[PDB]
Amino acid sequence: PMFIVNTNVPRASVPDGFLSELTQQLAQATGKPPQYIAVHVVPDQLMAFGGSSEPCALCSLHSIGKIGGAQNRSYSKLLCGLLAERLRISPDRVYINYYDMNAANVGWANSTFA
Amino acid sequence: PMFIVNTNVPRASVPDGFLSELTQQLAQATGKPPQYIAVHVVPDQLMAFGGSSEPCALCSLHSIGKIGGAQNRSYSKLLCGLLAERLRISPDRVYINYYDMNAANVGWANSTFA
Amino acid sequence: PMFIVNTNVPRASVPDGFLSELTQQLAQATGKPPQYIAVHVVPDQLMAFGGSSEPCALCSLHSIGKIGGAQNRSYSKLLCGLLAERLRISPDRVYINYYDMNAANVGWANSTFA
């Protein structure tokens, strides 16, 4: 699984260790080993949510499986929770796009997961 | 809806008010309230289009519905028009990927839109 | 086609001409004309892969067709090869998401490819 956060929060406001905390919690939520979790945080972005520039985030979570209506609700609670507690972004200024990737459509280590 | 522009145009060339303009014009084009529209502009990127580093943009529009053949033609006319007029990017150096997102696959405010 | 590379490798480590090399090799691999190939390289990112901040990359390749099990295996070999050789990123620290885009869902030059 791979989780990307794009935010207008500045770099200095991303706490030390936040990528590990994401890695860990994403591992627990998806059931996948942490070795397979990738995280990418993009601060200082020029962005707007609902027409204003208070803290916000545009995110994506891609996974081979473990994506669905109940699981995504749970992920959104977890990830909005973390964004609120660590980056101080209100949950109502966060979008998270979920993508259930086919194994044949993810490349890694010179081939695909298929 | 969420609209992302990635471009090699420099930051100083993005006009003041461009994110509000995009918010307003996308609210109008999609019919959605502006409170639900998110916009993200990423200048100064290292990019090429047809191998050239002349001005270009790679964009995405993600929405729960309001995506389809005729709508997307209309969005492309709108958005290429805005990128040409405001950022001086030729329409033939713009790509916009459209995504019709399932409500169950968009997280927001601690849950999904489902 | 559009190929995006996000990496923690620093900008100074991206060799001169790397975007052209990608454009050329992608054209040959996908069979698509080079004029239609867009490339985007984002260095200096804040990321983790398996929890570690050792060199890594999160990538995407979008194309109208030419996406499939065998093709994607071939692309992954090619692109991991290039990331290893040019950016010194281990293939096992690279994820590439593949997207077969509907023509009606790609905007370009004021319209779509449909």
From Swiss-Prot, chains A, B, C:
Miscellaneous remark of the record: Serum levels of MIF are elevated in patients with severe sepsis or septic shock. High levels of MIF are correlated with low survival. Drugs that inhibit tautomerase activity protect against death due to sepsis.
Induction text: Up-regulated in concanavalin-A-treated lymphocytes. Up-regulated in macrophages upon exposure to M.tuberculosis antigens.
Signal peptide stretch: none
Active site as annotated: 1
One GO molecular-function entry: protease binding
Broad EC category: isomerase
Modified residues (N6-acetyllysine): 77
SUPFAM superfamilies referenced in this protein's UniProt entry, alphabetically: Tautomerase/MIF (SSF55331)
Oligomeric form and interacting partners: Homotrimer. Interacts with CXCR2 extracellular domain. Interacts with the CD74 extracellular domain, USO1, COPS5 and BNIPL.
Protein name, entry field: Macrophage migration inhibitory factor
Illness: Rheumatoid arthritis systemic juvenile: An inflammatory articular disorder with systemic onset beginning before the age of 16. It represents a subgroup of juvenile arthritis associated with severe extraarticular features and occasionally fatal complications. During active phases of the disorder, patients display a typical daily spiking fever, an evanescent macular rash, lymphadenopathy, hepatosplenomegaly, serositis, myalgia and arthritis.
Organism listed in the record: Homo sapiens (Human)
